[PDB]
């Protein structure tokens, strides 16, 4: 487990506060204002990708990118 808990609870709190879907960036930029952390995109791209249970991508196309997220319906 170690700090990744963490990580998911913050993203979570992110698509939680602003109710449209949101990119890695936004989600990590979003991370860095509050809980005053810095952060790449990859670890939450990692974070997104690794929890299919709690996000999807709310493009099925394949014509967004960089990808738009959402909290599992």
Aim: charged letters at 25%.
């Amino acid at each position: 487990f170690m700090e990744t808990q963490k990580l998911i609870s913050m993203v979570k709190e992110a698509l939680e506060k602003y109710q449209y879907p949101l990119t890695a960036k936004n989600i990590k930029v979003v991370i860095q204002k509050e809980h005053n952390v810095v952060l790449p995109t990859g670890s939450i791209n990692s974070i997104l990708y690794s929890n299919s249970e709690l996000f999807e991508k709310i493009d099925k196309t394949n014509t967004i990118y960089p990808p738009l997220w959402i909290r599992k319906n």
